[PDB]
Write a protein that binds this ligand. Sequence first.
Ligand SMILES: CC(C)c1noc(N2CCC(COc3ccc(-c4ccc(S(C)(=O)=O)cc4)nc3)CC2)n1
Lengths: 272, 57, 338, 237, 128
Amino acid sequence: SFGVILAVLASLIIATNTLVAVAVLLLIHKNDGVSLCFTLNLAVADTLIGVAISGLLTDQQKTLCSLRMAFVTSSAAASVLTVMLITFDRYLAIKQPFRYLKIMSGFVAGACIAGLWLVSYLIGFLPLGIPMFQQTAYKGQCSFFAVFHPHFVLTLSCVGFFPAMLLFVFFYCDMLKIASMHSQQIRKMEHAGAMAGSDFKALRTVSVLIGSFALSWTPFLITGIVQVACQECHLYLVLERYLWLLGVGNSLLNPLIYAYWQKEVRLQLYHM
Amino acid sequence: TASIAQARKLVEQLKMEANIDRIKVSKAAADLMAYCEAHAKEDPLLTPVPASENPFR
Amino acid sequence: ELDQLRQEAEQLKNQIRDARKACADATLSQITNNIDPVGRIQMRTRRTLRGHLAKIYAMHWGTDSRLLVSASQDGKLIIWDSYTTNKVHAIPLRSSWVMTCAYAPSGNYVACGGLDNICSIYNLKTREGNVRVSRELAGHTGYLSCCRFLDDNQIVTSSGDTTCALWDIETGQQTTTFTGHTGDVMSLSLAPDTRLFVSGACDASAKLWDVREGMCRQTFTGHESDINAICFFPNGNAFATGSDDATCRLFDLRADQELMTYSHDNIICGITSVSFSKSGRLLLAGYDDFNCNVWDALKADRAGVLAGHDNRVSCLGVTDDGMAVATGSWDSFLKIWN
Amino acid sequence: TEDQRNEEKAQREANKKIEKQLQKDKQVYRATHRLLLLGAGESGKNTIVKQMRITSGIFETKFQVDKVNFHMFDVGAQRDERRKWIQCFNDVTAIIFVVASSSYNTNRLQAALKLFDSIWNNKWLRDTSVILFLNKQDLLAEKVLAGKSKIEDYFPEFARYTTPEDATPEPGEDPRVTRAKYFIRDEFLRISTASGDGRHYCYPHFTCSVDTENIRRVFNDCRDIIQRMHLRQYELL
Amino acid sequence: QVQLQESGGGLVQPGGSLRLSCAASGFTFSNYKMNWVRQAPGKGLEWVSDISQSGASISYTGSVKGRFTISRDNAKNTLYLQMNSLKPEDTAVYYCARCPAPFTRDCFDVTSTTYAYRGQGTQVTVSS
Ligand SMILES: CC(C)c1noc(N2CCC(COc3ccc(-c4ccc(S(C)(=O)=O)cc4)nc3)CC2)n1
């Protein structure tokens, strides 16, 4: 049953993300859209996540399975980094509207994407090199915690997801004050004009974005830290069979939040 | 001054335009149809050319 | 006295109307009834030219049916190679508001134009290899909407001051002025023999001009709004117009009156361009709803569509041998159909 | 054929050399802001143009603000019909509409209102924003504060009008002058706020021809236009 | 050809009533928004009122509000302007300009350079 569920999830991820990728590629051919490169990269990263998840369907071998787990981890890291890139792009557009037009370019987008993938696949395969992250006493069956020690996930949490979330929250909270001020000015002018003759939109959008970002990997990193702290607790059965699927199912949600919710990307898909 | 100038110029132009000869609509349509029929076979957009001679294929 | 002139003009208009009514005896639709319909036309995009930074306003084919020139909002004149798609020139204009472009029949010149009340002449055959500006013709008091070549030393230009003009490029001076329009002159077309030209002028009337003498030989009315485009029939004895009331009309020089109307209820946009095929059997129009239509010139039916653009179609063009048609658009792309 | 190969290679080389310069030009085109200046003979648009600068069919002005480049295009030497050459300005960030508020009755104010309404509702200018300058404030104040000129004669609704709640009168100004100013501003806002679309807005200011803050106002309004565009794009506004 | 002919002018004592009319031909009347303008001696042309295609978006100028009324009948292609309680300031020539194009919500039809789709005019005078 677990393998059946994994196969279904991988199929859905592959199909949706590939469809979104081709739609975005057609839109990029038509227009210029320097900000659609990041959406295309996100779709590619999510479909690669799906393929990697499909890779593990065999067992459901130490080196073979130490190389599969690294691939899956690198895919997840790339997907997490692309969303941060998108968020910084939006924040720089809003906060510095003139300098953004004066600086941003396809060369910058391509260089950033190359660096993204390089860092992602460095992070994926660091544990295979650093001796502390690696575990010992292999039994014959493989899993994320049969190769990689919980110290690896602790380090990832300390230097990764949580410092990233502290920025994903600050940016989208500073982008709310500006929208509030603009809405106030618009409402004032509208009232004046009407006399002469949306109040919970930005908050809703920001809440959806922040919840989607934060509910993906935090239940896994927190439980890994709990495992590191408490030795008596046997938090492996739930830690590598139930709490891992949320950060993977975030790949089903990302296309709906960064592709379908765009007006030009919904029209192109309808034309397709 | 300007108004009378405009009126007189318009009157002269209208007179000169009225002093012309006209052909019948049936004859004009026959001539147009004859031209289109005579030159029908030299129109690639009407009769598509084989892909060998097409330079945009 | 003035009222007498007005009444005499009204009487002359009545006389002309009576004469035209007398001349008509049967409709073009009745005449071309038994002719078999063309069937259906399905052209396909063979090329797509990229390189303009903004919306395209004009394009003109070359006499060899291979090269073409285009003008854009970005202030650039580009000379393409239709077969291979490799750019051959990119001339930077001094103004970004350009409404028309033309290519000399020899192929050694191009003409710019626009809202600065000038169309310039650029030499493409400089020994140094640099496309410099040769002549700058001034004298119009409103924007320029057409600037077409007669030979390497004669250009006929339309203007937004209600007058057309004929220039001799060598000394850069006018030679004739064509007055009589009340609105803005919006298009132009030279006769195949290059002895007469027509023009629609934003007052819902087209005219016939004699280049040699400089007088209005005929006036054609029947449109309800501004006339945007005008083309000559292949044999030189008729022409087609396109206006903002969403219809096209065919006029005959000899009969002196309209012959047919190309319209449909579903169409409520304005015609931006019109062009004839090599044999004159097809009339192609580009509309404001991002599509072009293919009309049967003799039957009045609709035969096809050129649906490949995502913004306003602003220009049209058929080659001098009927090999293909081009269409620019506001989405910045030139497309070639076959 | 070797000759054909040589010709094709030279053609590709020329195409690449052209593409490079087009790529260089795209950035300069994208990092520049174009503005259309409208108005009338009565309105002091000439003086505003002079302040910004401190048979040609169009005049061009270039000014720089904090390393940002603006291009202001002033139409001159054209006939009085507008429905044709007004479509050449579809892709400008803003229109600077200068209207003299001290010119009520010919009904110059009504003519300006009609022009604003037509421009606002045009079909190729349905995503452009207007930076409305209400000029000749000093003349308006001088005329209203002393004289028999009554606005209600030409704008009968002015009788039943009182200063809005959000008014910010300049300390040292008469209530009558403030009421007249805000009545004219509300008259101009009644047209624009009635669209109910969200793709363009109006930015009114109370200006004098010799004001030194007009370029700063244009800069700030362009910044607001771009910020609002992006916020609306990202589903926040 | 576009034709607009206005009639129903003359001389009226102050405080009287009048009714101008205009007949149109050569175009579809029901697809365009009609309009009235005027030009007093020594002054330029000025817009008076206008009405939509269906006839449900009327609007007047400030100085005629309440007195004048504009009504169009699309079954006969006619336009009317009922004037009530005239004053000496209403002495001018009244034209019947028309929308430049159909189906639009725009208008540029007051131009000094003779607007093509404007009528010839009818004289209205108010004196004691
Ligand atoms: C660098 C920083 C900015 C950053 N950004 O994102 C992140 N990510 C990195 C990856 C995330 C964890 O990824 C995993 C963990 C485990 C598993 C897994 C578990 C069980 C099995 S099984 C059933 O076969 O035994 C198979 C795989 N998959 C992916 C954490 C945060 N860091």
